[model samples]
Target: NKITPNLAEFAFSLYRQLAHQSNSTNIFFSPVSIATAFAMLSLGTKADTHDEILEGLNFNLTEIPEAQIHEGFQELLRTLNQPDSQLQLTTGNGLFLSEGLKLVDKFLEDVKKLYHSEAFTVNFGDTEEAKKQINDYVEKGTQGKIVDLVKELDRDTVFALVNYIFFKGKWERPFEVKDTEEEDFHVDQVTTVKVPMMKRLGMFNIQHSKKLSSWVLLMKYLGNATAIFFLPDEGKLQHLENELTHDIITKFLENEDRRSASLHLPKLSITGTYDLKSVLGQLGITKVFSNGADLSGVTEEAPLKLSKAVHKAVLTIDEPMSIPPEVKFNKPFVFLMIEQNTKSPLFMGKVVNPTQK
Candidate 1:
């Protein structure tokens, strides 16, 4: 339950960078899952290679013991994996290794012990079959929530990691299906699309930050989670995006108190896919991608390099908000699905032109 705070912050920081970089497209991801998967990978590293991975993850090897980092994830993953009566939340990880490649026993043990990840031997030489098998394992693990995650595989791909997390929650104050109305969602001043906008009026933990030019609404999911929706002033999404940070969210949540409001939010359903090879490298994790990489801890074989770091996630909610006379999330806005205790977003993304879904 006590994973280092920097790790979660790094994940959130990654999301902000992603959201900022892909402003034109819908963005979504599980920062926790990605970080956890990488934390699993770091198990097989030492010296500079290990240090670079930790630094990329926003961890200071000097301050945080490597063992504690791994242990924290083991605790967090197991907790998130527990079935709850109020929500459908699941996280899964897998290691697809080259058919003949052998991993160090301790490293292999750490994968299973800490991540509960399954190890499978696949023939990377057979790229098509490898793609299908990798996709199949992830698809099944995610309860069919994700499909076709891998389209092609690098023939020399000695080892690859695939991680997926699925989240489904009902709004504590649910939008009555009968109350949903078809409305025009202003994608931009010039374009609009018809979508099912859900309406509800109830007391909520809400704040209007004139400084940020955004209305921050705090609402809960079943059991242990909450959803925060940030509706920026018209054409002010960029401002909110620029100001977004783990610290900003921490401060807003610090003052959350239920108040009366009415909101009309779109019934949300969005999916996102990210090839993190470049993204991770952009975060200063260059060594893992090059021929100089020493992933020797993962396997005894030399000349092994990380070929890909792909992540796929889906966020579906039947329920979390209010507005004006009421709060209407009629225009584009940013949203986050978070575990209340951990303050880590299980899913975070933007909703623009829901029609794209």
Candidate 2:
């Protein structure tokens, strides 16, 4: 099963996805692999459950120095053993412990060897402002459904981490702010609660269903990733899943033409923290959290495995931000990853967001 149309394209695209996926006003883009962590969390039951996990565990240290800037930051995600391929060598999970808990003291012992790093994890403090900003954003993004996404902030027991997160969700059909009045949005079966729903409309890449009376809107990302929005045709959501194959998405990007129009987005905000364990468990990924997991490729430790994985995520709202221009799908849209210190590139992807970036 080919998940990515182009590996290079996906890597670069994900870099942007990582860099800006979290729309919160204040997320540290340099802390732990926060962006990578969120993407990983999205994977659910596949962290280290099988060789398939190996397919996703990727790192590209070729452009960046193969050394650490902060002692706490270590390379854990699988970096391709070679360039231009999907292959990778699994590193310790960058969770509370290295993936598979390679060794309690062993992983820490390696940190000590760095010469510059501290005896434990590293943290950028004076984050009171950052903390509050994140909290507010999460509650708003999830429409107040997700809170305390960041359960623990351990300074002493920290080793490696990613920083910050950014996210921007443009409705495939931008909703009219005026039309965003209160209404019922699947408040479960027994009741229909009224909530503010945006009524804007824009270009949408939709697919029809034969078995059901609905359309599924797919937001094409730069790489294999996508933010799938299923707006059931009133009473036929069950059939939406059947047409949710990944391939349908690939074909859309390769063949569809963008038409400038309107879109309606939900006025929503979400903030939450997740235990890499509970989140992965929901996806059936237990091996990475167990000692029995194999993470030896990272160290000579016996059957190295991940121990603890944690992530704090936030999606927030600002008064407003500038909008990009509308285009009729000309050249591939440029998505971003990281720009090297030399202005080269750590990753860059071409997303199909015909709307402005």
Candidate 3:
């Protein structure tokens, strides 16, 4: 429970960074995937390298013992992957290492225990083969939605850390396929494009936030997850971005009222791939990627420095319908898919243009 808030704080912080750099393009990524990968990487680090990774993730190490942090993530992962879950949400981590490079025994054990990550020893000397192996793993993890994620690989690369999250949920009250018709989406004041807009009329958890200046709608899935959409008033996107926080989102989740309305949303299929070296650097996590770093917990044979940190997320929202207060998401809006029980954000992004992949 305590870790959920920390995870949310990190989620919003990462979202802001990505949004700031996106320049209004389609934004989508799994915050949990990135956080889980780094937390697993932290096991191979020591001293400042370790501290920077966790602290940069918005965790207050002073308050929560380091041991509990990992435990919390372990529990969260277990709950999300439970066999009885109805929604299809699966996240995983992979560590691909140079064939002969040996990892610290305890580090290997911890990642498996806490993150359920798979480790593979590959021949990085054959860059193409290594690339294929990594890409294949990611493709399978995401059930074919993401492919060719690793286009290039350095021959000298000792190891690569990859994380992938895939989610598919049917709307609790699905929109009929026949109701989806070609609609004009306002990309901006001047730009308009035709999109297959999904429509449904039903009861929804909706609200208008005066403080944040955004219309909030909460749509639940068939299982224990929900998608929350935030539609800012014309030109209020920036203001909403500046004002949204984990607490405010929590309030919306707890306080939204059930109301009947008509809803219009564009079909969404978006992917976000990030070179985390620069992103984490901007977040004040620099030591891990530098030569001065201490990663003795991973391998002491060769000085290991993180060369690449890549994360890819894929989200497809189709086979859905709805209506009530006539909430039309005809323009760009921010959204989050959250696991209800723990309040963990599974995926977060903004759909700037639904037609853009």
Candidate 4:
């Protein structure tokens, strides 16, 4: 998918964050696009809904530190003493937001009816003033659920947004929880790499498309419009690499027609942990590595220039939260950064355990 500017910013932030966590090793940040498709479906709602969507995105940072880690703790302290804390911090997310309002206003100034009255919010204020401004506009747009999505977001008037998105699924007929236990995984064709793979056996509809040698099995989640891409037991991983890509993925999606079939996939799940340097460079985004790397678009905290980007990705087959017993092959699945109303994919990668390859 082609990424619009706004979505591109969010996607870029995801990449920048992933890049900061790792050392100099260049890593490819890859994830499937269908997940982003799910994220796009949730956009443009009330800030509360936006927050709900973000929370559901299930972005985990246990391994990747929060803003404080991304920026030195000392940096946070220094910023706190800023004359215009909000503007400086808001620019930190991207240099664009401050100008975003102006661009948005110019583009939609005449189309006022197109936005929620709250979509138009002032840039700064007192705690109550700030809260009141957002709360007021959000109410008109989201009916109060997201009344203060940007409450006290910045030190002053500028609003900084650190965003994320996540998508996952389970077997149509889930593997018996009893069937799940510590097991051995062949990291490759070498020594056994053990991790829990939910073992399930049932009638499976199988296809031998010349395009896929590992064999691809498509399964749907219970209620949501989500599907899990199960790829296993392949003889040649290279032939499938291209088809396994984001572009081919979008094509596979268009051709997918639900047909009744037996489904038996191991409760197997793949989790990838890597940084996004190699991929970004390959994607024509060399800005992060250059001395002149400019993230000034995020906020005006000049020191806020992103010095590093880090990513910590995870996927689990068990119930890790107040969610389902689903599986996610999440290694920074394919994503594109762009604007709010646009549908485009900027950069894409297939981040997985190097050992998996």
Candidate 5:
């Protein structure tokens, strides 16, 4: 009933939308990044513009006050960035404003206070330099996993918000390099490719979801994170997609029991870039990108409409292991990386072909 559940709902909602559009291709994105960026942008918005953003993110305004929602993000960010020696995980937000376009003092202060976002002034007229500055900041923020995030920027753009999350965690049970072997991976009914599948034998929390017709597996990281994989029965991927909800995922986490198995997962390095303008529009967030936009809180000097809203997420999984029973993720499957403390999905994706970037 708090922000975590709302965030989870938003995650699944966004996932479904992207999955539907992607067809049989691989899909990956950081739900937290999109949610956090929009949440911060809401500070600069007013009236219907503001309400649409929060509601689009699946938040119930009547249930939770606006202040509480921001505070939820504050608490979540603090928990996520906490120093952990075993895991290298960090997330941050940034605002790049056009030079001479003065933002309201309160909006700037609130974003810094609540979202820990830093403000930077750049000359949008110098599009190349501005793009480099933003991309450099993101590259450093995400430890270079996302180097060229801001590929294009409009010269007229007066405001830009960027969010980046970087996570690198070793498996609780490390997979040895010696155990990895090249094997056949079934991408679909007619396609199969050879991939280096890492194998391991150990105890894992696994379950068979009769309702969704999928097998669920929970793999823990060395720190406060876990990766949940969903392998649907043959042609039932659509069924699993239709039935997955925050409640069902929570049940899988709480009710699943530990058992022994042999597991095979392919090493993966994947990235996803999304045009937030169109994606958010599909989620009923249109006013912010249109001429009727009221971002007065951001700047009263001029009427500012969001000219560009781009989101990029990068994830690399390598050298992780375990096994109890024989569970082969040799086909298309869905994965969610969850923060154990807040239970927020750090990342969500589907692997249609491991060999495909």
Candidate 6:
């Protein structure tokens, strides 16, 4: 299978699970960062265990050759990290191995070559020090958007993987900061709070879906990234969530006819983290986390199991503050960030109540 479609499917699957986990609080995550770590791990896995990791990631081993899968990811990594790209986007992986744990040469080399991962050996016995070192690397990778991502390392952990993705971009048409004002934002049926909402009306490629009862708005970054925002009709948030899928997104974009629309969006800056091991287990990724797991490719004698799969992401959208026929976002909504060329998800978030942030 091509990496593009698989990425879309995998992202949607992970979002559904994460959203459910967040309950009603605001949430955001980078699927590519999570997938990158798993892809690296697949290189070191064999037999059923190997296939489980791939399948859990929405890949079909029969449909896609292992080499091509890595090739596709290699292309994805290169494309996302193009030096001249418009966005300040970067993703990296870190493997904190037990002080004496030795990884197979091929495993280490493949991860370095294909995923651009940084490997380190930390003395897990000194758990606090190891935690600080690992978190420090992640903080630097994401330019401080993510810090202290790991609070502690399990004493028995032989290895832990951390992935972080940071993105900073400007709107093609920015909002003037002077125009911002605090306004009442509906939190839910009986709650409301004022948030510093920014208002503007400019040319936006937007459309509505009567079937979905949602307005799909396309917001572009100064570069090649685009964010698709979904505003569900009164009380239809649950319906939209239940029906979200890759095809729904594909069809929505195809149906969108670009037109200038009035817009009001609250200045947004949100951070989110996911304990992916729990979520992945919910998706039938249990064996790899168990003691009986087989990851011989890492080391035949070390007897390792995946100890952690943590993802951290931060998104900021504000224009230096500055609309027509108007669309006001005074309630809950969802947003998806995608790379234009490959149409892969870079980040996804839902604001149940913007005022909470």
lDDT (10s digit) by residue, model 5, range 275-325: 889888988898888888989988987888877778877766644344245
- Candidate number with the higher lDDT (2 or 6): 6
TM-score, cand. 2: 0.44
The root-mean-square deviation over C-alpha atoms between each candidate and the true structure, in angstroms, is: 2.8, 13.4, 2.8, 15.8, 2.9, 3.1
Which is superior by lDDT, 1 or 5? 5
lDDT of 3: 0.82
Clashes of each: 8, 64, 15, 54, 7, 10
**10 residues in a row with least lDDT, candidate 3:** 316-325
* All candidates: TM-score: 0.92, 0.44, 0.94, 0.41, 0.93, 0.92
Q: Model 5: what TM-score?
A: 0.93
Q: Write the per-residue lDDT of candidate 3 for residues 110-151, one digit (tens) a residue.
A: 888778898888888888988899999988877678888877
- Candidate 4 per-residue lDDT, tens place, 1-357, comes to 222222334444444555455422223322322223223222222233333333333333344233322132223223322443222111111111232343333323321231111123343435456446544543443333222333234353333222111222243365445554555444344545444434443333334456655444444342222232424334453345334433443444445553334332334333333323333344333443344433332223442222222222222233422332222232212222211112233223333342453
Name the runs in model 4 displaced over 4 angstroms.
1-169, 172-178, 181-184, 203-205, 222-235, 243-264, 268-274, 288-304, 318-357
lDDT of each: 0.77, 0.34, 0.82, 0.33, 0.82, 0.78
Q: Return the number of clashes found in candidate 5.
A: 7
Worst 10 residues of 2 by lDDT: 84-93
Best by TM-score: 3
Over 300-357, each residue of candidate 6 has an lDDT whose tens digit, in order, gives 7878888877877766653413224578788888888888777778888788776553
Clashes of 6: 10
Give the Cα-based TM-score of candidate 3 against the true structure: 0.94
lDDT of 1 by residue, 89-204 (tens): 76777888786676788888878877888878888888888889999998888777788998777777877778777777676655446667898888887888887877766667
Off by over 4 Å in 3: 174-178, 318-325
